[PDB]
Amino acid sequence: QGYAAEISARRNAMDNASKNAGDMINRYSILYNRTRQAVITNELVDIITGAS
Amino acid sequence: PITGKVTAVIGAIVDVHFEQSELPAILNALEIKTPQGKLVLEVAQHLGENTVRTIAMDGTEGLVRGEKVLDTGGPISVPVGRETLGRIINVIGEPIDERGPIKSKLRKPIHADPPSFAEQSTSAEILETGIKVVDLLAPYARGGKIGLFGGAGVGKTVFIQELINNIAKAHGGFSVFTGVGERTREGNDLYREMKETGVINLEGESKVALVFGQMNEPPGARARVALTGLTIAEYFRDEEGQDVLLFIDNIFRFTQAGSEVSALLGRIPSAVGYQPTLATDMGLLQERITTTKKGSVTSVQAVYVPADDLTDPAPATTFAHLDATTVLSRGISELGIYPAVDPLDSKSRLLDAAVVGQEHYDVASKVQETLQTYKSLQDIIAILGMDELSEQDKLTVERARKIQRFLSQPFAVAEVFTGIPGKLVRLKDTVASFKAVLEGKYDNIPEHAFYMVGGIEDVVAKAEKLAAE
Amino acid sequence: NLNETGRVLAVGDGIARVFGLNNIQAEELVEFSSGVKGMALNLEPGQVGIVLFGSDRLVKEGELVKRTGNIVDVPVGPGLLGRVVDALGNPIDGKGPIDAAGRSRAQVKAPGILPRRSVHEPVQTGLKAVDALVPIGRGQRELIIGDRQTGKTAVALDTILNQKRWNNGSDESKKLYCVYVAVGQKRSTVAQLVQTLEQHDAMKYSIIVAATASEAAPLQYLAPFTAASIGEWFRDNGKHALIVYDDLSKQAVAYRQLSLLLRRPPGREAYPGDVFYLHSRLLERAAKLSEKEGSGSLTALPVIETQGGDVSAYIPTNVISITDGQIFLEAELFYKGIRPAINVGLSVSRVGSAAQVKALKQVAGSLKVRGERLTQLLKQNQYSPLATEEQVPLIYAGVNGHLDGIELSRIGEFESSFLSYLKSNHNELLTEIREKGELSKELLASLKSATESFVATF
Amino acid sequence: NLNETGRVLAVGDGIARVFGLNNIQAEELVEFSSGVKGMALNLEPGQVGIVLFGSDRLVKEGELVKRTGNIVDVPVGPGLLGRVVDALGNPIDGKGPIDAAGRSRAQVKAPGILPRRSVHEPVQTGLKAVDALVPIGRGQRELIIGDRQTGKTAVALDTILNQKRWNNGSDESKKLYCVYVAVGQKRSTVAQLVQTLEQHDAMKYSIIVAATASEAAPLQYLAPFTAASIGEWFRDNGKHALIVYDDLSKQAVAYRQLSLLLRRPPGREAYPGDVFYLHSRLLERAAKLSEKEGSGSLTALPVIETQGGDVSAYIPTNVISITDGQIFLEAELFYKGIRPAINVGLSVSRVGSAAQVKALKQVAGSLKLFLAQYREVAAFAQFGSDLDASTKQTLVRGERLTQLLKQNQYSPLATEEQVPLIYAGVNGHLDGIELSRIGEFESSFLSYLKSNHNELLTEIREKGELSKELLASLKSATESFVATF
Ligand SMILES: Nc1ncnc2c1ncn2[C@@H]1O[C@H](COP(=O)(O)OP(=O)(O)OP(=O)(O)O)[C@@H](O)[C@H]1O
Ligand SMILES: Nc1ncnc2c1ncn2[C@@H]1O[C@H](COP(=O)(O)OP(=O)(O)OP(=O)(O)O)[C@@H](O)[C@H]1O
Ligand SMILES: [Mg+2]
Ligand SMILES: [Mg+2]
């Protein structure tokens, strides 16, 4: 009964873990896009100021 | 006409000098009588010394300095009216279908000024499309903007053709399609599909006017095709008094062409790389799609999202205008539910009890809750089996699946491929039918009776047909 | 006569370079032959730079430019009430001309330290959550910040609609006139907002300044300053005004456009360095004045759209630095059905309790299973504003515990059934809570006798 | 005479500024006294900006420049078959001059909507992973994308080598002439590529247009367009051409250099604004024409080198948006010994499924699903006996299938040899064979059908589609082999 219980609690635990991983991915997927936009803008500010 | 001479050629930018001291106005169209067809240039700036800086609508190769240029006396003018129906037009208003001239009596400029505040519609209203899922769970606004999402296999072109046919039958309104910066092969596919469906008929009354810019065209052309299609739509509005659909595919390419033109004209690029004029350039186009006392222009716009970022300036500025969204998904097609509209990711600002009414809003809300709960338990349903549910959750699932296949609809355009007769479903009938399903009045009818029937009055006959079988 | 007239040397990117106009003032308004108006932004030797309040198509090289003799100015007065006006004050509703009481500059300094007074009288929004947890005072700057489709406009529209019960009364000092600056908004949305205000009769006391997305970037830039100069008339003549800016993000975008087209070097987020100055001299004008000046007040509710829900962006952070608070509307709550989606955590009014009605501060006991029903009670339908004599009992029954015993789905029906009964039977207490504004302990007990009775009768 | 001639004012890096040349045409070719020639990309009010096809050392201030009157053009015809030419059409293989059948401009308009036709004919690559799961049609634009040393050049070159089955036949409608645009590639790599082609006799139907890393940037910018103008002759004369651009990222780099030295305002990634109008104007000249125009075609396989496999970059995004599909080659599969390293999950052909060979479609329809399931179960595999039988079957099949789709380079297989193998696999007949011996199986199987069932291969390729009866005979031969294998 302990073996069954630990398997079930190792199936629900990793479920919660994977869903928390999904939420963290959905946050870092916004942080990433923000950094992407910032990087492009600033690289181009540098290029323009060099070209002025 | 007032004659000038070219002085500089730097890519798609051409500077013209006008010695007579009678200069062309900004956004006016100059044309050079080159071999292999005359070339149109649009005035972008007045630089001084009687010199005007312009953007070319076609390749500038072969231009000599000192080449003669004529001022057309107005902006790019395009033909309008019935004659444009069933024909392919370029940005500068020429026939590229090679079936001859468009012998329209009128020509109108594409740089029209949008209607005044005093001429707007004071209250919102729905453009009944005949498609159950849209008209119920995400209705399209009259005079509004509708964003269509999805790529291949999801039936986008058939959806467009069905919108055209339904509007032409219910509302009598013609339609205009603009391919802005998309692939040429896909436009030929659309042309042949439209000939087979029956929305283009070279020997009769066509329903849709085609304007086709494409990737091969310079950025200055892509930046203006939409205004040509918009002018045809506006002419069908203001003169004939119709409710006219305007398809744009793709709008991100309008934004991108604007960024390219800005970069070429020397303007300092803004945020992630778009033109500083982004919001105003989008507005000058979108705010002409609006309802007036004469009629309404309603726009269906394909909206590509760079890097899947709904926060890239182009998506953001587009979404700021959109009144509705319709998401076509491969997943809903794998379930066989054509026209594949995701009833839960689609949305509309006009789905409010003030606009549609409570009779409608209650049905829509209940339907979305049913499907949302079904989706919210759509895994344990497989693990534990449908029998392990609560009886109430079981009933909600039986309603959900039945509704899900009741959102299916056969299209009259697809008849020539699917062989099934196509149907309209009016808004009254759709709302009443889904209320009847929600109240359980047709629980005892098997699921398959809801697949591609139309209204509930046909669910009846299909239940009887299954009974015979 | 080059002293008062000039000729366009060049025109492009919305900027016009003009010869002459020797005697021109800085920021002076100029009229081109085509009737299009411009602002003399930069003066150089032998040439003047003019921003165009209109499409550049209307201007051509060689065309004459004339001095109007006046800094950029807007008509002001009470004759504007019930009207829609463009950024320069021209009527666009077609109801006729503006019976202006005078004209006032667009760019005028905020009043200094001495003329002001502490904000101490409330702007009753009719919304439980704002009136009770993040109060807005007369003279405050309170930012409504959120993502798209999150209730931003509805909060300010309810604040406008709710004032009708006072704007009708004879008491001139309780009235609150309203101004709504639609920057970047579609003319259709503005026309629908106008029809909504008209069908609720809220237009008698509201002014709409519209610089829509089809309007040239200079006009989007200018509209808020003229709306402020309109509110400042009510302020400076002893009357109370409220100004909603919907929304400053698009004014910032328009100023970025105007600047980058003038080759102004880009800073962070490609925005110009002077965006903080764009907003600070706009929002500092919202001030509560002393009895030496006449006790007027201008209340600013700026609106901001946040990309992806991030408050760490440049413009949001700038306006948070300028303003005296923020009401953060969160999309997660909106989709969950919590409408208005007030994030009570990120929300704060740094003047706070000073403006709040004494009744609600006495009752609430700093409201910032029981809490779930409290949230359900804070939910509010659009265009359905509540009075303070109605809000006080609703917070009362939940803070003192009465509501914990009622089914969750049924709270929305208690609210309807209680305030009706309290009105049908116990209007005396409502009249006291309204007139006095502060509960006596004996009226605290009367409210307990009412709630402990009705909860049982429900 | 300042109409026909001019004088140099300044010489920078690959750029020159010339006074005069009033009557000069935009994009016109000019020759300096020293013999170096260049193209006039910028015409200004009082000077002309000319990009040089050679070293600055050959141009000095005060030097005379003479115009040719000819916009940049390339020779065209069949005489170019078997030749190696520079971007301007000068032969560099050391053999004699080219008997051009005319000349054609580089920048010429792509064909429009009306004259095109649905892509309906197969471009048989001979690579099992492509013909079966990501097919290419005659008229398609198909992007080969992936990191360095992942198999791109090999895919293109195997496609080129395979067509000798047909280009030696008399049916002019099935032949497929080939063009390879080596842009930014090493000169030694092009030399040994030419040698690989000449060993397999592929050269007589191939053309190599070479703009190597040591050649000026203008030539790297031009080469793709001149190869397109070469293939367009075949397109327009009712013949079928394939053009492989290896690779367009270096063309974008050349254009960036060319524009920044001309001081044109840059955009994102330092690239000019209209790079999209560079790659589209290049690619969508590929087309399948209608009967009114001779029903020719030109097929484009552009190559893009993605750093770190990121497709978020600017030029890759643009080309992914322009093309009718992509073939994604992944390093993760390459260094695990899979060859070609085609990611079946990311690769897509939006057109070719209509063009695919029927014999292959019938048998491979389910290979997409089996592989998509294997790609999931692969993570769980290493655990062992714990796995359910309904997943052990998947794990047994997908291994043999992945080992089948891999093949050695310069060995492109005929459809008649491809369909039996995909059949044996999808129908699970290989399950009784150790995964280490599949290569022994295939090489043996071909010999058996060729030696004892040739009638069936002959019918497969004569008809292209499997009758009710041919599927049965194939099942019989496959099982009789697997049993006795
Ligand atoms: N308090 C509320 N309760 C319920 N629904 C509301 C409430 N306020 C607004 N809504 C609804 O939600 C929608 C929100 O639109 P809103 O007025 O918030 O636009 P906005 O967010 O200010 O501007 P945008 O959506 O363009 O960013 C409206 O359709 C309205 O019907
Ligand atoms: N199918 C295959 N089987 C075995 N080896 C292969 C296969 N395909 C490619 N290779 C090997 O991998 C290497 C691939 O170089 P290839 O000719 O593909 O250039 P590439 O992958 O485009 O690299 P680069 O980006 O440097 O051109 C070669 O050494 C080749 O021998
Ligand atoms: Mg709003
Ligand atoms: Mg290679």
- Compute the radius of gyration of chain C from its Cα atoms: 24
D330 Cβ below 6 A of ligand 2: no
3-class SS string, C216-265 = CHHHHHHHHHHHHHHHHHHHHCCCEEEEEEECHHHHHHHHHHHHHHCCCC
**By the 8 A CB rule, do D102 and D230 touch?**
no
CA distance C11 to B156: 44
Chain A residues with CB under 8 Å of D263 CB are 51
Chain B residues with CB under 8 Å of A37 CB are 271-272, 309, 311-312
C274 touching A (Cβ < 8 Å): no
The residue out of B303, B319, B350 marking a domain boundary is B350
Mark whether B49 and B163 lie in a shared domain. Answer: no
Domain total of chain B? 3
Q: Reduce the DSSP state of residue D159 to 3 states and report it.
A: helix
CA distance C368 to B225: 56
C62–B23 CB contact, under 8 Å: yes
Separation in Å, CA of B383 to nearest CA in chain A: 13
Q: Reduce the DSSP state of residue B202 to 3 states and report it.
A: coil
Query: CB D393: neighbour CB atoms within 10 A?
Result: 15
Q: Which two tokens stand for residue D127?
A: 């690579």
- Compute the radius of gyration of chain B from its Cα atoms: 25
Instruction: Enter the CATH code of domain A14-52.
Output: 1.10.287.80
Question: Burial level of B457, CB count in 10 A (0-12/13-18/19+)?
Answer: exposed
Angle at CA of residue B312, ends B310 and B313, nearest 5°:
120
**By the 8 A CB rule, do C26 and C43 touch?**
yes
Fold of D1-70: Elongation Factor Tu (Ef-tu); domain 3 (2.40.30)
Chain A residues with CB under 8 Å of D256 CB are none
- Residue type at position B419: G
**By the 8 A CB rule, do C393 and C357 touch?**
no
**By the 8 A CB rule, do D45 and B8 touch?**
yes
What's the Cα-to-Cα distance from D339 to each of D152, D163, D169, rounded to whole Å? 11, 21, 30
Query: In chain D, whose CA is at the least distance from the CA of A44?
Result: D268
Task: Work out whether strand D206-211 and strand D84-85 pair parallel, antiparallel, or are unpaired.
Answer: parallel
Mark whether B293 and B147 lie in a shared domain. Answer: yes
Backbone angles phi, psi at B272, to 5 degrees: -35, -5
**By the 8 A CB rule, do C287 and C111 touch?**
yes
Among B7, B11, B184, beta carbon nearest to D116: B184
Between the CA of D151 and the centroid of ligand 2 the distance, in Å, is 4
CA distance C195 to B120: 11
Enumerate residues 6+ apart whose C-beta is below 8 A from B343. Answer: B133, B137, B138, B367, B368, B371, B404, B407
Question: Burial level of D272, CB count in 10 A (0-12/13-18/19+)?
Answer: buried
E-strand ranges in B140-207 read: 145-149, 175-182
B307–A36 CB contact, under 8 Å: yes
Mark whether B268 and B193 lie in a shared domain. Answer: yes
B287–C212 CB contact, under 8 Å: yes
Domain boundaries, chain C: 1-70, 71-356, 357-457
Dihedral-angle region of residue A36 (phi above 0 means left; psi in -120 to 50 means alpha; beta otherwise):
alpha
**By the 8 A CB rule, do B436 and B425 touch?**
no
D269–A51 CB contact, under 8 Å: no
Dihedral over alpha carbons D187, D191, D193, D198 (to 10 degrees):
160
CA distance C262 to C49: 10
Chain D residues with CB under 8 Å of A50 CB are none
Rounded to 10 deg, the angle between the D275-283 and D248-261 helix axes is 140
CATH of the domain at B31: 2.40.10.170
Backbone angles phi, psi at D193, to 5 degrees: -65, -45
- Residue type at position C255: Y
Backbone angles phi, psi at C413, to 5 degrees: -90, -25
Give residue A9's Cα distance to chain centre: 26
Residues spanned by the domain of B132: 76-350
A47–D263 CB contact, under 8 Å: no
**By the 8 A CB rule, do B270 and C256 touch?**
yes
Chain A residues with CB under 8 Å of B311 CB are 30, 33-34, 37
Q: Which two tokens stand for residue B291?
A: 């309802």
What's the Cα-to-Cα distance from C5 to each of C8, C16, C24, rounded to whole Å? 10, 14, 9
Q: Which residues pair with B341 in a beta bridge?
A: B328
CA distance D409 to D418: 16
CA distance B7 to B30: 14
Q: Count Cα neighbours of B334 within 13 Å in the Cβ-side half-sphere.
A: 3
The active-site residue out of D350, D375, D397, D400 is: D350
**By the 8 A CB rule, do B365 and B357 touch?**
no
Mark whether B154 and B28 lie in a shared domain. Answer: no
Q: Reduce the DSSP state of residue B336 to 3 states and report it.
A: coil
A51–D312 CB contact, under 8 Å: no
Query: CB C294: neighbour CB atoms within 10 A?
Result: 13
CA distance B374 to B354: 28
Backbone angles phi, psi at D55, to 5 degrees: -70, 140
Pick from A32, A44, A48 the residue to mutate for testing the B interface (most B CBs within 10 Å).
Answer: A44
Of B296, B353, B354, B323, the residue nearest C199 (C-alpha): B354
CA distance A30 to B311: 9
Q: Reduce the DSSP state of residue D144 to 3 states and report it.
A: strand
3-class SS string, chain A = CHHHHHHHHHHHHHHHHHHHHHHHHHHHHHHHHHHHHHHHHHHHHHHHHHHC
CA distance D438 to D352: 29
Give residue D287's Cα distance to chain centre: 14
What's the Cα-to-Cα distance from A9 to each of B152, B380, B385, D99, D385, rounded to whole Å? 42, 17, 21, 79, 21
D336 touching B (Cβ < 8 Å): no
**By the 8 A CB rule, do B255 and B274 touch?**
yes
Give residue C219's Cα distance to chain centre: 18
Angle at CA of residue B272, ends B270 and B277, nearest 5°:
35
CA distance D330 to D171: 37
CA distance B257 to B243: 29
Among B269, B271, B311, beta carbon nearest to A33: B311
Query: CB C389: neighbour CB atoms within 10 A?
Result: 21
CA distance D169 to D167: 5
Q: Which two tokens stand for residue D177?
A: 């002439």
CA distance D323 to D142: 6
Of C97, C25, C88, C105, the residue nearest C52 (C-alpha): C88
E-strand ranges in B273-362 read: 296-302, 324-327, 347-348
CA distance B456 to D251: 60
DSSP assignment of B107-148: EEES-PPPPPGGGS-SS--B---S-HHHHHHSPPBTT-EEEE
Pick the residue whose CA is nearest to atom 25 on ligand 1.
Answer: C149
Question: Burial level of D368, CB count in 10 A (0-12/13-18/19+)?
Answer: middle
Q: Reduce the DSSP state of residue D349 to 3 states and report it.
A: strand
Mark whether B196 and B211 lie in a shared domain. Answer: yes
**By the 8 A CB rule, do D184 and D375 touch?**
no
Fold of D357-484: Lysin (1.20.150)
D102 touching B (Cβ < 8 Å): no
CA distance B462 to B119: 48
Query: CB D323: neighbour CB atoms within 10 A?
Result: 25
CA distance D358 to D135: 12
**By the 8 A CB rule, do B264 and B55 touch?**
yes
Ligand 1: list residues with CB < 6 Å.
B 349, 352; C 148-154, 305, 339-340, 380-382
Enumerate residues 6+ apart whose C-beta is below 8 A from C190. Answer: B117, C84, C182, C208, C210, C212
Enumerate residues 6+ apart whose C-beta is below 8 A from B268. Answer: A48, B276, C260, C261, C263, C266
Locate the ligand 1 atom nearest the alpha carbon of residue B320 and give its number: 26
Pick the residue whose CA is nearest to atom 8 on ligand 2.
Answer: D151
**By the 8 A CB rule, do B83 and B103 touch?**
yes
Q: Chain A, 8-37: which have a CB under 8 Å from a chain B CB?
A: 30, 33-34, 36-37
End-to-end CA distance of chain D: 84
Q: Which residues pair with D144 in a beta bridge?
A: D303, D327
Rounded to 10 deg, the angle between the B427-438 and B456-468 helix axes is 60
Backbone angles phi, psi at B422, to 5 degrees: -95, 155
CA distance D110 to B215: 10
Task: Work out whether strand B208-214 and strand C177-183 pair parallel, antiparallel, or are unpaired.
Answer: unpaired
Pick the residue whose CA is nearest to atom 10 on ligand 2.
Answer: D151
Among D265, D269, D312, beta carbon nearest to A51: D265
Of C257, C300, C261, the residue nearest C279 (C-alpha): C300
Among B268, B273, B311, beta carbon nearest to A40: B273
Angle at CA of residue D415, ends D412 and D416, nearest 5°:
115
Q: Reduce the DSSP state of residue B401 to 3 states and report it.
A: helix
C213–B277 CB contact, under 8 Å: no
Question: Burial level of B105, CB count in 10 A (0-12/13-18/19+)?
Answer: exposed
Q: Reduce the DSSP state of residue B57 to 3 states and report it.
A: coil
- Which among D127, D149, D303, D335 is the best mutation to test ligand 2's pocket, defined by most ligand atoms within 8 Å of the CB? D149
Task: Work out whether strand B296-302 and strand B145-149 pair parallel, antiparallel, or are unpaired.
Answer: parallel
Mark whether B326 and B357 lie in a shared domain. Answer: no
CA distance C143 to C347: 10
Separation in Å, CA of D279 to nearest CA in chain A: 21
Enumerate residues 6+ apart whose C-beta is below 8 A from D125. Answer: D131, D136, D155, D158, D159, D162, D412
Total length of chain C:
458
DSSP assignment of C122-144: B---S-HHHHHHS--BTT-B-EE
Of D126, D121, D123, D125, the residue nearest D414 (C-alpha): D126
DSSP assignment of D400-466: HHHHHH---TT-PPPHHHHHHHHHHHHTTGGGGS-GGGHHHHHHHHHHHHHHH-HHHHHHHHHHSS-
CA distance B421 to B440: 28
3-class SS string, D65-123 = EEEEEEECEEECCCCCCCCEECCCCCECCCCCCCCCCCEEECCCCCCCCCCECCCCCEC
- Residue type at position B467: A
B268–A37 CB contact, under 8 Å: no
Locate the ligand 2 atom nearest the alpha carbon of residue D407 and give its number: 1
Q: Which two tokens stand for residue A23?
A: 């939420």
Locate the ligand 1 atom nearest the alpha carbon of residue C340 and give its number: 1
Determination technique for this PDB entry?
cryo-EM
Of B238, B282, B236, B291, the residue nearest B259 (C-alpha): B282
**By the 8 A CB rule, do D212 and D190 touch?**
yes
Q: Reduce the DSSP state of residue B463 to 3 states and report it.
A: helix
CA distance C129 to C343: 10
CA distance A21 to A15: 10
Angle at CA of residue C450, ends C445 and C451, nearest 5°:
100
Q: Which two tokens stand for residue D415?
A: 């459809």
CA distance D23 to A39: 45
Give residue A30's Cα distance to chain centre: 8
Backbone angles phi, psi at C293, to 5 degrees: -95, -35
Q: Which residues pair with D48 in a beta bridge?
A: D18, D43
The residue out of B323, B350, B377 marking a domain boundary is B350
Total length of chain B:
469
Q: Which two tokens stand for residue A45?
A: 């500010």
CA distance C432 to B387: 59
A36–B268 CB contact, under 8 Å: no
Give residue C214's Cα distance to chain centre: 22
Of C57, C36, C63, the residue nearest B26 (C-alpha): C57
CA distance C280 to D291: 68
Q: Which two tokens stand for residue B460?
A: 């009846």
- Residue in this structure with the two tokens 């042309």, named with its chain if needed: B191
* Residue B41 host element (H or E): strand B39-48
D148 Cβ below 6 A of ligand 2: yes
Total length of chain A:
52
D125 Cβ below 6 A of ligand 2: no
CA distance D380 to D370: 16
Q: Which residues pair with D187 in a beta bridge?
A: none
A44 touching D (Cβ < 8 Å): yes
D158 Cβ below 6 A of ligand 2: no
Q: Reduce the DSSP state of residue B302 to 3 states and report it.
A: strand
Query: CB B5: neighbour CB atoms within 10 A?
Result: 14
Domain C357-457 has CATH 1.20.150.20: yes
**By the 8 A CB rule, do B238 and B114 touch?**
no
B7 touching D (Cβ < 8 Å): yes
B279 touching C (Cβ < 8 Å): yes
C273 touching A (Cβ < 8 Å): no
The residue out of B296, B322, B350 marking a domain boundary is B350
D149 Cβ below 6 A of ligand 2: yes
Q: CATH homologous superfamily of domain C71-356?
A: P-loop containing nucleotide triphosphate hydrolases (3.40.50.300)
Chain B residues with CB under 8 Å of A44 CB are 269, 273
Q: Count Cα neighbours of C7 within 13 Å in the Cβ-side half-sphere.
A: 6
Mark whether B63 and B173 lie in a shared domain. Answer: no
D22–B88 CB contact, under 8 Å: no
Query: In chain B, whose CA is at the least distance from the CA of D312?
Result: B307
Ligand nearest, relative to CA of residue C150: 1
Side-by-side strand order, sheet with C206-211: C84-85, C206-211, C177-183, C240-246, C297-305, C143-146, C325-329, C348-349
H-helix segments, C22-75: none
What's the Cα-to-Cα distance from D162 to each of B302, D119, D153, D403, rounded to whole Å? 40, 20, 14, 21
Between the CA of D169 and the centroid of ligand 2 the distance, in Å, is 30
Q: Which chains touch B (3 or more CB pairs under 8 A)?
A: A, C, D
Q: What is the structure's resolution, reported in angstroms to one decimal? A: 3.1
